[PDB]
């Protein structure tokens, strides 16, 4: 085992045995690690364990080198040097933050704060460790064996005793048994297979744990500033449609990487596709974490870019329905649209990474490892929703801690900012501009006079932990009878269980705030449901109200966010 130290890069044979990722640690840092943490197992070619027969001493501080072997204080020969002395551990080729990443359980916010404020090699170590911990936690949950079938979209399940039950929402995807991946929604439950299969009684579902691979490439490559556009060739004949972004497309060619903060409806997809029309011969790889964000880029490319040079990359193990209008899996097309987890090993003139608030440092590193590009563009908004951190239960994660790109956008500011929201009525724009954008987001549309807010706490019931507020759905029902124009509205709430009750009572299409991100609707009916930290999250609130093009009805629980809404108040 010959490699480089994760804290100093000094070559060493040593690796920490108690670290779940086995990081290579140099003699000066390996000591600093074992002497300050519960981690005492050290691994070089042979473990630093006692060579005496039947001896169970593995702590490196209680061990010595006796000639060419290792022994504890009870078996060491007279001529034996301690392995731990003078700030070093004997190894070939002869920090507080590394200890904290190495030993935390990833349940606190301060753990993620650290995984983003540390050095670049420690950011990769933190993302490798966190992902390995997240996967092992999936194994702790119990197996759900099918006790019976009801119909084509409903079933009943038997859970494992002793092992806790994972929460039922489309977030947690099970693997059927190999009957394909399956999703559930709340003893009557709604079953949904990625593959159409006549539900087998006896078969079981298990949360499939992917193997965490090691990170090699940084989350952000080292920045390079140029005095000319590099490797890219602009057009002089550029349609007036994209004239607004000409100066920013040039900024893109005069830097190795660039950040774009685009509040909702400010033109991110337009900017991303227009960059292809500006550097017309440049091969562009369009990437995002979700299939929906890649599909949304495909919809904009279909309108402006030639359908022949466009390819949508679909992983052979297809899970959800995606874009069907490009030639599929043709890696060598000029315009390649693909999710981070399915990226092939290829090079590009430009790489566009959209919905950057949803990326983790693990995703950021994977992109830098599978794609070698002249220019990298990071598009998103740190005021929108981040990736769900499953293990995180204590504390709240601020935008500057979502990933490396968000960290930059929230501290030094973004390289480019789309300041005019063209989607929302002014009431909505004026609310989110003051809430999350320090009054720098401006309204293109006029006030629609179709933005209403109602202060109604109702009654909070729970479907395990996911909340329901029937009096809030009852208030929406009464409003709908008086304003039937709102019959075509999308119902939005922070909880899938609230959305299940509202789908049956109201008959409106349903969307959680988290699944609505990147989408727009003429009318939106939002019920806050609870007054929790989840439902009062300003990034989730910002996404919730910025889905509307024409009108919105907000039934609120929080007096703070109700007062911040610059909407017409209703009564009943």
Q: What is the 3-state secondary structure (H, E, C) of 19-84?
A: CCCCCECCHHHHHHHHCCCCCCCEECCCECCCCCCCCCCCCHHHEEEECCEEEECCCCCCCEEECE
176 assigned binding-site residue: no
Q: Which is nearer to Zn ion, 42 or 501 (CB)?
A: 42
Q: Which is nearer to Zn ion, 78 or 484 (CB)?
A: 78
User: Which residues, other chains included, contact 43 with Cβ-Cβ below 8 Å and sequence gap of 6+?
Assistant: 1, 14, 15, 16, 17, 22
Q: Which is nearer to Zn ion, 19 or 350 (CB)?
A: 19
CA angle 167, 171, 176 (to 5 degrees): 80
29 assigned binding-site residue: yes
Task: Report the chain's terminal Cα–Cα distance, integer Å.
Answer: 72
User: What are the C-alpha distances in Å from 143 to residues 131, 200, 297, 394, 533?
Assistant: 22, 15, 38, 27, 31
Q: Which is nearer to Zn ion, 72 or 322 (CB)?
A: 72
298 assigned binding-site residue: no
Distance CA 379, CA 262 (A): 7
Q: Which is nearer to Zn ion, 102 or 548 (CB)?
A: 102
* Residue linked to tokens 């909880």: 495
Least distance to Zn ion, CB of residue 64, Å:
10
> Is the C-alpha dihedral spanning 309, 302, 306, 422 positive or negative?
negative
451 assigned binding-site residue: no
Q: Which is nearer to Zn ion, 27 or 157 (CB)?
A: 27
Positions touching Zn ion (CB under 5 A) are 5, 7-8, 16, 18-19, 26, 29, 39, 50, 52, 55, 57, 72, 75, 102
265 assigned binding-site residue: yes
251 assigned binding-site residue: no
Distance CA 207, CA 359 (A): 21
Q: Which is nearer to Zn ion, 48 or 437 (CB)?
A: 48
Distance CA 521, CA 276 (A): 28
289 assigned binding-site residue: no
509 assigned binding-site residue: no
Distance CA 449, CA 433 (A): 18
* Residue linked to tokens 């298990």: 206
Least distance to Zn ion, CB of residue 5, Å:
4
263 assigned binding-site residue: yes
* Residue linked to tokens 């409806």: 265
264 assigned binding-site residue: yes
Question: What residue ranges in 323-383 does DSSP mark as E strands?
Answer: 335-339, 346-353, 371-380
123, 126, 129, 132: CA torsion to nearest 10 = -70
Q: Which is nearer to Zn ion, 16 or 416 (CB)?
A: 16
Least distance to Zn ion, CB of residue 57, Å:
5
Maximal C-alpha separation, the chain? 93
Least distance to Zn ion, CB of residue 10, Å:
5
Least distance to Zn ion, CB of residue 8, Å:
3
Least distance to Zn ion, CB of residue 6, Å:
8
* Residue linked to tokens 């704060």: 113
Least distance to Zn ion, CB of residue 41, Å:
8
Least distance to Zn ion, CB of residue 368, Å:
23
Residues annotated within a binding site for Zn(2+): 5, 8, 16, 19, 26, 29, 33, 39, 50, 55, 72, 75
Residues annotated within a binding site: 5, 8, 16, 19, 26, 29, 33, 39, 50, 55, 72, 75, 262-269
Residues annotated within a binding site for a ribonucleoside 5'-triphosphate: 262-269
């Amino acid at each position: 085992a010959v490699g480089a130290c994760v804290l100093c890069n000094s070559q060493t044979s040593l690796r920490c045995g108690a670290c779940i990722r086995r990081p290579f640690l140099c003699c000066k840092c390996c000591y600093d690690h074992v002497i300050s943490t519960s981690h005492k197992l050290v691994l070089s070619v042979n473990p630093y364990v006692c060579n005496a027969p039947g001896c169970d001493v593995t702590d490196v501080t209680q061990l010595y080198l006796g000639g060419m072997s290792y022994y504890c204080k009870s078996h060491k020969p007279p001529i034996s040097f301690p392995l731990c002395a003078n700030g070093q551990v004997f190894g070939l080729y002869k920090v507080t933050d590394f200890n904290a990443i190495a030993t935390c359980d990833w349940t606190n916010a301060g753990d993620y704060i650290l995984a983003n404020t540390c050095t670049e090699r420690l950011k990769l170590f933190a993302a490798e460790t966190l992902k390995a911990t997240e996967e092992t936690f999936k194994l702790s949950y119990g197996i759900a064996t099918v006790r019976e079938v009801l119909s084509d979209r409903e079933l009943h399940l038997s859970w494992e005793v002793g092992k806790p039950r994972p929460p039922l929402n489309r977030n947690y995807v099970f693997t059927g048994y190999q009957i394909g991946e399956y999703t559930f929604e709340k003893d009557a439950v709604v079953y949904r297979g990625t593959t159409t299969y006549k539900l087998n009684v006896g078969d079981y579902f298990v949360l499939t744990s992917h193997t965490v691979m090691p990170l090699s490439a940084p989350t952000l490559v080292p920045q390079e500033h140029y005095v000319r556009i590099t490797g890219l060739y602009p057009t002089l004949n550029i349609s007036d449609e994209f004239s607004s972004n000409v100066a920013n497309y040039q900024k893109v060619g005069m830097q190795k990487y660039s950040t774009l903060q685009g509040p909702p409806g400010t033109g991110k997809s337009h900017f991303a596709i227009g960059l292809a029309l500006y550097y017309p011969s440049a091969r562009i790889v369009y990437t995002a974490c979700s299939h929906a964000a890649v599909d949304a880029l495909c919809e904009k490319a279909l309108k402006y870019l030639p359908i022949d040079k466009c390819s949508r990359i679909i992983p052979a193990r297809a899970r959800v329905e995606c874009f069907d209008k490009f030639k599929v899996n043709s890696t060598l097309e000029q315009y390649v649209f693909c999710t981070v987890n399915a990226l092939p090993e290829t090079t590009a003139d430009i790489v566009v990474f959209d919905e950057i608030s949803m990326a983790t440092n693990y995703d950021l590193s994977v992109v830098n490892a599978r794609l070698r590009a002249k220019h990298y563009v990071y598009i998103g908004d740190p005021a929108q929703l981040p990736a769900p951190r499953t293990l995180l239960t204590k504390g709240t994660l601020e935008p500057e801690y979502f990933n490396s790109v968000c960290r930059l956008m929230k501290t030094i500011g973004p390289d480019m900012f789309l300041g005019t929201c063209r989607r929302c009525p002014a009431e909505i724009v004026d609310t989110v501009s003051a809430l999350v954008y320090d009054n720098k987001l401006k309204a293109h549309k006029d006030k629609s006079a179709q933005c209403f807010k109602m202060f109604y706490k109702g009654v909070i019931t729970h479907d395990v932990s996911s909340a329901i507020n029937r009096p809030q759905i009852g208030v929406v029902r009464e409003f709908l009878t008086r304003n039937p124009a709102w019959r075509k509205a999308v119902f939005i709430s922070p909880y899938n269980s609230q959305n299940a009750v509202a789908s049956k009572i109201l008959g409106l299409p349903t969307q959680t705030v988290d699944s609505s991100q990147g989408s727009e609707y003429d009318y939106v009916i939002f019920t806050q449901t609870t007054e929790t930290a989840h439902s009062c999250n300003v990034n989730r609130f910002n996404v919730a109200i910025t889905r509307a093009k024409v009108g919105i009805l907000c039934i609120m629980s929080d007096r703070d966010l109700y007062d911040k809404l610059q909407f017409t108040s209703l009564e009943i």
